[PDB]
């Protein structure tokens, strides 16, 4: 037909590509880091687009871990360190009313802190849980803190949240965000209904492990989500369709009092408790989480057989982090046992255990002391998915809750997104030509 | 007046008619990852607009050439091409030869410029 | 089936317009290029004008490119030309006919498709 | 000649006459501060030449349009404007317009890039 | 063909076949480093293409103007400029004359621009 090459700038097409994502939306998130956001939701269906989604390979995880750790750090950063506090101290068991689950669990202690000038010492007494101090032989003490023998513990600054907030991930221009509008989406392969954003809906930063918390809904059913379903050292996210509400809870009244520690310093420590002392727990509604954990085995058979019994199972063993379902509530950190909710064959208490100085992340040679809240806590929050692990054992299929890897905490959210390049050159024969 | 990229899965020629809806698109510690993915996006603009200089095709979103098409790098009639194809499906059945066409194209400006310069010094 | 039907009108006196009106069916309008062909009562065929498909471009014979006007409307699909000052040379039936060009996107023509039943224009 | 907004107080007939002095001005921890303003001048000059370019302008700092004026836009007659008023006047009444009026030749000119292509594909 | 400065030691007119060539390898605290070297990269090219704007020879590598070669710039010939010399030594001969010929340039095209804006304002 003699046609020539005609060359168009403005062309609807994109390659996959990876590139760094800008954030948008007192607070460890979105002080001076993040862009403010537009308030239009400028979200535009593409017709008759099918698009190849994967969310194990999706690097806005990659990029979202390293955003919340990094800013993380530089939260923490600008703080009072605690080691002049790296001292023995004598503790002794707290004389207050002690119920049967916490006897051992807190422990009164006193020790000889800095004050605000270097030649001056202050006799100081507090209140720590037993999971932040362990044993020590010295004269005139019996413990000391958890750390001290393997790291600094900062002092997280008061007044600065940690409550997650929505965090928007924006592309550059050039790039586009694409989004899979796809109920009931396996997470993995072609995508009919994509649509194109500027930016994602705004992403809670929600730490937590074994249970997904006050994260997004299934649209109807319960999805079933892994990079390989049959290699069992994968972990299985599942995604809820309808909330379960858990309650949790720390009963004590706790009065915080605090000291200085150095010029322009303060350490903040529980002074004592009002009223008995009980342990921490969070309820989950029984008939609710029964029908749950019905649902999750009704879409498990899809994969495991439809004649194939399916059992959980508390977890097999470890480090507390991982073992446990650990949670932010009102700046404090639960560690609650959730071995009531996953034992069965196909109002329920959780105890939970409140450990001040932690890790965040399996990374070593950091570590945060979190301060105490006075009063009461009490959070109420949405359970909206489970991090599974198949147990590698034949029939009968046991399932166990998951640990924290954190990605999977941020794959729950951001599995429906992709970032695209926008190539805006491209060619086709036309009979158009010059002259 | 389908937005940004409205048109990715409309027919090449539906499509051709959407080019200024997107091609604004392509302008518009924590300070360095913004401005480098600024710079980015300058430096993405900044070298396809390049290109089209160096084709003669500077100041147009619709530049017509004079290289033929040789029937290898696709052999499908333009109503199959235009009418029955998204530039999506396009732009992978001829990736393979974007790097021939390019240089063809470059090629061509290079003779044409010479040509007019030729022209131009007739009196 | 294909159809076109023009509506125009008959006999003006010389130095006055007439204006013709073809209504077409069975097509997508909006597609194909349209045409004006004319054949003198005794004579051949001639090319009178030609318009593209969305409008936009026009062609006339010299012999009338500063007296005719060729327009469409896609939306009624109609095509319509308006004929100023009007010689005795001009007698002849008018055909609509679809074809005779190519939005480069398109496969070649030039040729015309479809002829209408054609409208008698005379002058006095 | 008169400075790089020498011409600012003076008549659009004059102050016209100056576009490249203002044209060739626009151009040219601490590094992030510096950064962001080349930034921001390079990304305000980019939009600037992709809207020109959009508009079929680009390369000229005086471009003439098919869009006609609407009386609407504006009701002084040619010589008021040009011969009395200066352009920050005239940006300010015309304000209220100008998206409209960019608009329109976006419109412009995509109805005539296609044009150009359907003369151009005549054999 | 030669590379991106293959042309460097050819003489002026072997040279000028691969101006697309040079062309196009003009685009491509840690951090601010490598962002000033990028700022500062996409600086220059677009205050070159501002210039070749204003000249109005945007969008060419080669582009022809009005302005009359003055013998006191350089009185060669022709056959000693395009042949039995390089770029390099007539960059050495044509220093203190770079600003004036670009003064013309810029002038030139203004009224060049003006006289279109003439001719099209006839009906
Ligand atoms: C899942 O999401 C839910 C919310 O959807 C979270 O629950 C919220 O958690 C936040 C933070 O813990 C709660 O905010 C706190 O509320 C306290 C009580 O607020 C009452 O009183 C105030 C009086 O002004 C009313 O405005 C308000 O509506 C309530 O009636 C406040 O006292 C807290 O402020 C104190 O602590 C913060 C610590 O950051 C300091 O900055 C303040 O200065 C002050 O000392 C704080 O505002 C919020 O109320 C909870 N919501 C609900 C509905 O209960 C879950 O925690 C979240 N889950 C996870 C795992 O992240
Ligand atoms: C932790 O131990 C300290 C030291 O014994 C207790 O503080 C004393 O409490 C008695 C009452 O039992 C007071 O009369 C003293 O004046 C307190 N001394 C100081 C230095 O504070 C403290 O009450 C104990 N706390 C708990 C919860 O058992
Ligand atoms: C969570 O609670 C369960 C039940 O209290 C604990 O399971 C017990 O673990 C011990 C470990 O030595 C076993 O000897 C018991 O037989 C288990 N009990 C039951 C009923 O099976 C579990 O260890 C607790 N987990 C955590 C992390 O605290
Ligand atoms: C600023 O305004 C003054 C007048 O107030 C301009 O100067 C003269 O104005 C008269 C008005 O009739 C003109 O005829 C003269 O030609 C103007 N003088 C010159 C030297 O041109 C003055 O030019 C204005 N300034 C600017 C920068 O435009
Ligand atoms: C403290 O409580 C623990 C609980 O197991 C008990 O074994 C210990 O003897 C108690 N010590 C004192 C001094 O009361
Ligand atoms: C002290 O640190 C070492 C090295 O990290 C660790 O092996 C040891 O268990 C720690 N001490 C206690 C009492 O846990
Ligand atoms: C929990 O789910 C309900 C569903 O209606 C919703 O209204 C509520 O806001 C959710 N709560 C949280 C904390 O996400
Ligand atoms: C869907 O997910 C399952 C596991 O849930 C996986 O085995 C399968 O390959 C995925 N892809 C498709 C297209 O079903
Ligand atoms: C899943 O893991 C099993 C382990 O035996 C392996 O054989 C299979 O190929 C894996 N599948 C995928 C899709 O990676
Ligand atoms: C949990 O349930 C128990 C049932 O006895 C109740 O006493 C307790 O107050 C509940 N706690 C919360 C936080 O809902
Ligand atoms: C409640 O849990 C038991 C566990 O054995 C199960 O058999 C029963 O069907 C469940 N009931 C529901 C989901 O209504
Ligand atoms: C699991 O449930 C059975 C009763 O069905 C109970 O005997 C057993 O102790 C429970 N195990 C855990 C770990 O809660
Ligand atoms: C704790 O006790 C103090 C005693 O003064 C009281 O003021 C405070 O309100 C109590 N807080 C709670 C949450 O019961
Ligand atoms: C999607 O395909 C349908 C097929 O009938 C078509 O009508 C529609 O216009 C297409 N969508 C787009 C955005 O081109
Ligand atoms: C284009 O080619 C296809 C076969 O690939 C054929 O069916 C179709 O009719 C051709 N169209 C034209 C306009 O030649
Ligand atoms: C001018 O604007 C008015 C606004 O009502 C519109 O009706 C009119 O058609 C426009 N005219 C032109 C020539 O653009
Ligand atoms: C322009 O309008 C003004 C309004 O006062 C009038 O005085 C002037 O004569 C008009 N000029 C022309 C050329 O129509
Ligand atoms: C633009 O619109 C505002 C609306 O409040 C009006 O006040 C203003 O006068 C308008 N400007 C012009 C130049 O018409
Ligand atoms: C260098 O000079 C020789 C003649 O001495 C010539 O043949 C050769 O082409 C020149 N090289 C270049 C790169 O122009
Ligand atoms: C050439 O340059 C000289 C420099 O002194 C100047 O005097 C002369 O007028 C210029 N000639 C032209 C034709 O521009
Ligand atoms: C150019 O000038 C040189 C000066 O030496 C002379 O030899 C040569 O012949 C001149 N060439 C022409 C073509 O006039
Ligand atoms: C430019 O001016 C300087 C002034 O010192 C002079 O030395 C140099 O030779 C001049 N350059 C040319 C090319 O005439």
């Known amino acids: 037909e003699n046609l020539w090459v005609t060359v168009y700038y403005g062309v609807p097409v994109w390659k996959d590509a990876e590139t760094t994502l800008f954030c948008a939306s007192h607070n460890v998130w979105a002080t001076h880091a993040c862009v403010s956001t537009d308030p239009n939701p400028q979200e535009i269906h593409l017709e008759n687009v099918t698009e190849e989604f994967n969310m194990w390979k999706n690097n806005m995880v990659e990029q979202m871990h390293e955003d919340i750790i990094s800013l993380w750090d530089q939260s923490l950063k600008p703080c009072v360190k605690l080691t002049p506090l790296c001292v023995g101290l004598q503790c002794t068991n707290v004389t207050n009313n002690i119920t049967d689950d916490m006897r051992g669990e807190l422990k009164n202690c006193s020790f000889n802190a800095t004050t605000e000038l270097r030649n001056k010492r202050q006799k100081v007494y507090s209140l720590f849980y037993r999971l932040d101090i362990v044993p020590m032989v010295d004269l005139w003490t019996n413990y000391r803190l958890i750390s001290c023998n393997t790291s600094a513990i900062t002092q997280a600054c008061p007044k600065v949240s940690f409550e997650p907030i929505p965090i928007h991930y924006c592309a550059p221009a050039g790039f586009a965000i694409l989004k899979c509008k796809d109920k009931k989406f396996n997470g993995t392969g072609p995508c009919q209904n994509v649509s194109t954003v500027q930016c994602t809906h705004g992403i809670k930063p929600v730490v937590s492990t074994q249970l997904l918390l006050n994260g997004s809904l299934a649209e109807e059913e319960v999805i079933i989500r892994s990079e390989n379903i049959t290699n069992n050292a994968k972990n299985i996210l599942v995604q809820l369709n309808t909330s379960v509400q858990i309650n949790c809870t720390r009963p004590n009244n706790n009065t915080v009092k605090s000291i200085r520690i150095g010029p322009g310093q303060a350490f903040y420590y529980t002074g004592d408790i009002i009223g008995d002392i009980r342990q921490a727990h969070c309820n989950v509604s029984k008939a609710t989480w029964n029908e749950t954990l019905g649902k999750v085995v009704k879409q498990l058979r899809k994969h495991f057989g439809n004649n194939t019994i399916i059992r959980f199972a508390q977890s097999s063993g470890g480090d507390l982090e991982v073992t446990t379902h650990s949670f932010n509530c009102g700046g404090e950190f639960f560690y609650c046992n959730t071995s009531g909710l996953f034992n069965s064959t196909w109002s329920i208490t959780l105890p939970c255990r409140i450990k001040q100085i932690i890790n965040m992340w399996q990374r070593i040679g950091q570590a945060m002391y979190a301060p105490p809240i006075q009063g009461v806590i009490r959070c109420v929050s949405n359970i909206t998915g489970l991090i599974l692990t198949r147990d590698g054992g034949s029939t009968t299929e046991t399932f166990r809750p998951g640990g924290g890897d954190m990605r999977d905490n941020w794959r729950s959210e951001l599995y429906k997104y992709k970032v695209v390049k926008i190539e805006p050159l491209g060619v086709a024969p036309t009979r158009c030509k010059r002259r | 007046s389908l937005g940004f990229l409205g048109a990715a899965g409309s027919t090449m020629g539906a499509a051709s008619m959407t080019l200024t809806v997107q091609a604004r698109n392509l302008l518009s510690h924590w300070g360095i990852k913004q401005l480098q993915a600024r710079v980015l996006a300058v430096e993405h603009y900044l070298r396809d607009q390049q290109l089209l200089g160096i084709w003669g095709c500077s100041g147009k979103l619709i530049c017509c050439t004079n290289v033929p098409w040789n029937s290898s790098w696709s052999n499908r009639n333009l109503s199959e091409i235009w009418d029955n194809m998204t530039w999506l499906q396009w732009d992978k059945e001829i990736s393979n030869y974007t790097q021939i066409i390019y240089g063809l194209l470059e090629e061509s400006q290079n003779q044409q410029e010479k040509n007019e310069q030729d022209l131009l010094a007739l009196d | 089936e294909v159809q076109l039907v023009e509506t125009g009108g008959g006999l003006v006196q010389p130095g006055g317009s007439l204006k013709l009106s073809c209504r077409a069916s069975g097509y997508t309008f909006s597609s194909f290029a349209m045409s004006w062909v004319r054949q003198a009562p005794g004579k051949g065929l001639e090319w009178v004008s030609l318009?593209?498909?969305?409008?936009?471009?026009?062609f006339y014979v010299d012999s009338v490119k500063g007296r005719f006007t060729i327009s469409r409307d896609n939306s009624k699909n109609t095509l319509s030309l308006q004929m100023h000052s009007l010689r005795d040379g001009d007698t002849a039936v008018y055909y609509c006919?679809?074809?005779?060009?190519?939005?480069?996107?398109?496969?070649?023509?030039?040729?015309?498709?479809?002829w209408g039943q054609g409208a008698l224009v005379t002058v006095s | 000649s008169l400075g790089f907004l020498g011409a600012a107080g003076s008549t659009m007939g004059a102050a016209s006459m100056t576009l490249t002095v203002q044209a060739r001005n626009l151009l040219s921890h601490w590094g992030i501060k510096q950064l962001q303003a080349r930034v921001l001048a390079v990304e305000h000059y980019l939009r600037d030449q992709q809207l020109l370019g959009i508009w079929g302008c680009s390369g000229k700092l005086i471009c003439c349009t098919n869009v006609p004026w609407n009386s609407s836009w504006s009701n002084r007659n040619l010589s008021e404007i040009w011969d009395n008023m200066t352009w920050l006047q005239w940006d300010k009444e015309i304000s209220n317009y100008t998206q409209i009026i960019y608009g329109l030749l976006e419109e412009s000119q995509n109805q005539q890039e296609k044009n150009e292509q359907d003369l151009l594909a005549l054999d | 063909s030669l590379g991106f400065l293959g042309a460097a030691g050819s003489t002026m007119g072997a040279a000028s076949m691969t101006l697309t060539v040079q062309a196009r390898n003009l685009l491509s605290h840690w951090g601010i480093k490598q962002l000033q070297a990028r700022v500062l990269a996409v600086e220059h090219y677009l205050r070159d293409q501002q210039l070749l704007g204003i000249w109005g020879c945007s969008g060419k590598l080669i582009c022809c103007t009005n302005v009359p070669w003055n013998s006191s710039w350089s009185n060669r010939n022709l056959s000693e400029i395009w042949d039995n010399m390089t770029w390099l030594q007539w960059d050495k001969e044509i220093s203190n004359y770079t600003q004036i010929i670009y003064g013309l340039l810029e002038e030139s095209q203004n009224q060049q621009e003006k006289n279109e804006q003439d001719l099209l304002a006839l009906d």
């Open positions: 006919a679809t074809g005779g060009m190519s939005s480069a996107l398109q496969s070649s023509k030039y040729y015309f498709d479809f």
């Open positions: 318009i593209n498909d969305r409008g936009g471009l026009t």
